[PDB]
Amino acid sequence: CQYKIYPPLGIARVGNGPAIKPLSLSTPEVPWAHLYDTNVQYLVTQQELEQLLEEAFGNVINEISQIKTKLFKQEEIETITGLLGLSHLVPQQQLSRSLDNLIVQQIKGALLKVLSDHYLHAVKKQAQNFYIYKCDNPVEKLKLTDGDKVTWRVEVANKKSFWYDYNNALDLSLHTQGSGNLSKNVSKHRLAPAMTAKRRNPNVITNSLRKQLVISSQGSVSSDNNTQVPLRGKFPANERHNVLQGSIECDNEGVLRFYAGNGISQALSPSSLNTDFADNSNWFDDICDGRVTAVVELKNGDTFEIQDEQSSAWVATTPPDYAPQIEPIVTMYDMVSGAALKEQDLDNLTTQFSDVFPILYRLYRMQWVNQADFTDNAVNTQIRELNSELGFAQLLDNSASAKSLREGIFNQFRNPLFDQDIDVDDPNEWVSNSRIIPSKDETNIAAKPATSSLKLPFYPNDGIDYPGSPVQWFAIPPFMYQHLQNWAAGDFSVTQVEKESANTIEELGLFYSEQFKNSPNSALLCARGALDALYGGGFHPGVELTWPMRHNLIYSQNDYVSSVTPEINLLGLREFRLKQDLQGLNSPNMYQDFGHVIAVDNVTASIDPNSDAAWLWRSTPGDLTKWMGIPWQSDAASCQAVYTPEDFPIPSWWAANLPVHVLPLARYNKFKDSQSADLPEINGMTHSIAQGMSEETFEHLRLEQFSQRLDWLHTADLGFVGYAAEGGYTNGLIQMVSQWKNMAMVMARPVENPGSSGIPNVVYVAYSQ
Amino acid sequence: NQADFTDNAVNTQIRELNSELGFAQLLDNSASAKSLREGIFNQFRNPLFDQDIDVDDPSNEWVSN
Ligand SMILES: [Mg+2]
Structure with missing residues (x-):
């Protein structure tokens, strides 16, 4: 092994x-890296656009x-247009049309309003950089000396419209001895049986015609030329309709940058409405996924x-992340780690405090995107009580005098064995x-x-369809619940340096x-970030990816390296x-399926890597995302609260990436x-009223807000x-196609002087119109 | 059912026979009546479900044509 690409799985939103x-x-x-960074700008700002324009106006002034x-005229026009390299951001004529209708400051002002209509407050693309690392096992990024070049290739596809309905995760009925991600109890005791699933777009018959439902594109960029290349497919x-699945550029140092699409979903007819959370015929979106490879050409001829x-x-x-600094309590990198673990080996797991802190820390931070974790979570309130007395470090104490404290917290967490709180x-x-x-x-009939x-935590889970099944509700996976169980029992290690930085949960997180x-x-x-x-x-199906990711079968390699x-x-x-x-897009298995339905029996038959159904795991482009909802906006609109007859706590699906209750700029x-x-004006009051009231009442007002x-x-x-609007679940799904953006x-935003109010110095604020 | 009134060729052929008082040829098991019996039989769907398909x-899939 000479050179490798990182990350192994890149994400672009x-x-x-x-x-x-x-x-x-x-x-x-x-x-x-940036959990407390109060300078973040995830929407496009006026200042960014203004900056971008003067850089185009940075010359131009002499020339105009x-x-x-x-003395405009239609090619006075074009000489002005040509020198502002802005035709890669807005169409030709919109710029010109805005100029023929009306002093350097009035071409800027006219042009700025064009970029502002298109982009002001726009959800920024989250692009993925890919790097070549020299190996011996990675040591260092490849460093191009003159004569060296790298050539990247990327082939992507979307098969959502070609694939099967998503009713629930097929692996729920898969016979297993158990992994770090999913206990054997689910399948063996049939807590949430996998359902059969029919084909999407079932009126397209024969494999030959169904190939039309698959969108694909590809392209290559090298370190000799940084011009951006689009990844444009067609549906059908x-x-x-053209579909921009993404775009790719490569800089002189050899870094590939991958941009996702614009967020455009559309039906083939405007009357075809996306009223189901996941399976909507006649629809396509610009989600993709695919294979990234490269070629390294040194000057001494070697390749x-x-x-x-x-x-x-x-x-x-994937969909956008609407709270980039709020992390899911269980992440996809946790599914990778769990997949390499066998359930009956969890007794040999060793536990440090740094292995349980993410659970408590992420759950604590869910308060900014989900009401239940802000006002109805007894463990997050216990953490506040410890913070208020600088006594968070007792949670790091593994001795007997702290066992009551650890156990009290651990006992509130759901056991992924799904064998507690049940009458057989x-x-x-x-x-x-x-x-x-x-x-x-x-x-x-009267509820029991x-x-x-x-x-x-108070989140729905894989078995939501089945009232009374313990898998309706979410549990941290087996290996992470094992870490928490060792912690409660005392069987964990932690350094003095950690203790000294552990007076509050925020201090330890910063550490x-x-x-x-x-x-x-x-x-x-x-790779982990x-x-x-x-x-x-x-996974019902989830947000970005779904249940195949939690099986080791999808990885050609999955090894622990180090702490x-x-x-x-x-x-x-x-x-x-x-x-x-x-073979990528040329694979003979690109267009494979299981006939009229998919069922757990197909998954069972795919376990054997020699069998004819093992293609399921050997990914071709589009295989990771084809499971998700089409269009994704129906999924996102479906991904919110699930009310119970009891008002509180309000259950929420995926609040860390698709928040449910937020703290608005207002x-x-x-x-x-x-x-x-x-x-x-102070906190929405006139100066005089703000300063006329007592300090008690002022801070109180702050806290209420x-x-x-x-x-x-x-x-x-x-x-x-x-007036008279229907609202409701279904209209949410429909409207999200246009309103997602x-x-x-x-x-994150600062509060410079919280005083006595109880408002932290960093708050997490929702920005919209 | 309308299709069996105005869109069923086998009901219509029965009509033709009835109108000539000739329905008894359907009870003929001889070779001279074979075309007539086959003509009605070949219009019926076969419950083997292996006709009018493209494989x-x-792994194989049966797709009606
Ligand atoms: Mg988030």
């Missing part, structure tokens, strides 16, 4: 912001005054092909005696009173974030690679100021606006 |  570096974001390459005095493939599955990479595109129906059905989540199909408390920043394994951190912001459960720090694990770093069909502007602020959380579905018009985007 | 990429 759709956005209506442009595909240029100054106005786009980059997938995290180091976990926890030269025909200023030579070869009336007919190294980066093509095999150990060395090359994959890219998937006369032996063999497992029926929960905790709070169930009813079906919308009501039955006017619950006898056991509702465990944590651990520094351990990531200085760990010398950039190739493996980049790509996946640590993605969700890892529940993050020699003394600090932090759930570790791994070297993993997806299984790949090396409220931020009403608590961010102090009473002493030198502003004519801070406490107001707004349904995220209400941050744009999803069908509830206007207007939904609130959560960003 | 898609034989």
Whole structure:
């Protein structure tokens, strides 16, 4: 092995912001890098656009005054147009049309308003950088000397419209001995049976014609030329719509940058409405995923092909992350780690405190995107109590005097064995005696009173379809619940250096974030950062990817490498690679399926890598995302709260990436100021009223404003606006196709002088119109 | 059912026979009546479900034509 690509699985997220570096974001390459960064701009700002324009006006001024005095005309027009390299951001004529209708300041002002209509407040694209690392096992990024060149290739596809309905995760009925991600109890006791699933777009018959339902494109860029190349397909493939699946550029140092599409979903007819959460015929979106390879050409003639599955990479595109600094409690990098573990080996797992802190830390931070974790979570309140007395470090104590404290917390978490809080129906059905989540199909018979408390966390899960099944609700996976169980029993290790930085949960998080920043394994951190912001459960189907990712069968390699720090694990770093069909879009299995339906029996038959059904795991382009909802906006609109007859806690699906209850800019502007602020308006009050009231009442008002959380579905018009509006679930799905780009985007923001109010110095604020 | 009134060729052929008082040829098992019996028989769907199909990429799938 000579050279490798990192990350092994790259992620790029759709956005209506442009595909240029100054106005786009980059997938995290180091976990926890910017959790408290109050300068983040995830939407396109006026200042960014203004900056971008003067850089085009940075020359131009000499040239326009030269025909200023030579007096517009249609090619006065074009000489002005040509020198502002802006035709890659807005169409030709929109620029010209805005000029023929009307002093340098009035071409700027006219042009600025064009970029502002297109891009102001636009959801920035989250692009993925890919790097070549020299090997011995990675040591260092490839460094091009003159004469050296790298050539990247990327082939992507979308098969959602070709694939099968998503009713629930087929692996729920897969016979297994159990993994780190999924206990054998689910299948063996039939807690959430996999359903059969029919074909999407079932009126397209014969494999030959169904090939039209698959969108695909490809392209190559080298280090000799940084011109951006689009990845443009057609639906249906070869009336007919172009689909920008992404774009790719490569800089002189050899870094590939991959931009996802614009977020465009569309039906073939306007009357075809996306009223189901996942399976809507006649629809296509611009989500893709596919195979990333490269070729390295040194000047001494030598050439190294980066093509095999150990060395090359994959890219998937996904919905946007509406709260980039709020991390899911269980992440896709956790599914990778769990997949390499066998359930009956968890007794040999060793536990440091840095392996359980992510669970408590991520759950604690869910308060900014989900009401239940802000006002109805007894463990997050216990953490606040410890913070308020600088006594968070007792959670790091593994001795007997702290066992009552650890155990009290651990006992509130749901056991992924799904064998607690159940009455066994006369032996063999497992029926929960905790709070169930009813079906919308009501039955006017008295509910059975619950006898056991509702465990944590309060999120729905793979088995939602089945009222009373313990798998309705989410549990941290087997290996992560094992870490938490060892912690509660005392069987864990932790360093004095950790203890000294552990007076509050924020201080320890900052400390651990520094351990990531200085760990010398950039190739493996980049591989883990790509996946640590993605969700890892529940899968119904989820947000970015779904249940195949939690099986080792999808990886050609999955190995523990090292801890993050020699003394600090932090759930570790791994070297993993997806299984790949090396023929790519030319694979003979590109267009394979299981006939009229897919069922767990097909999955069972795919376990054997020699069998005829093993292609399921050997990915061709489009295989990772084809499972998800078509269009994704129907999925996102479906991904919110699931109300129970009991008001609280409100259950939520995936609040860390698709938030449910957020803190809007409106409220931020009403608590961010102090009473002493030198502003004519203070927290939405006149100066005089703000400073006339007592300090007690002022801070109280701040805290009340801070406490107001707004349904995220209400941050744009999803069908509830206007007199007599219907609103409702279905209109949400329909409207999200256009409104996804207007939904609130959560960003860290400062509170310089919280005083006595109880508002932290960093708050997470939802920005929308 | 309308299709059996105005769109069923076998009902119509029965009509033709009835109109000539010639329905008894259907009870003829001889060779001279074979074409007539076959003509009605070949219009019926076969419950083997293996006619009027194209085998898609034989794993094999039966797709009606
Ligand atoms: Mg997030």
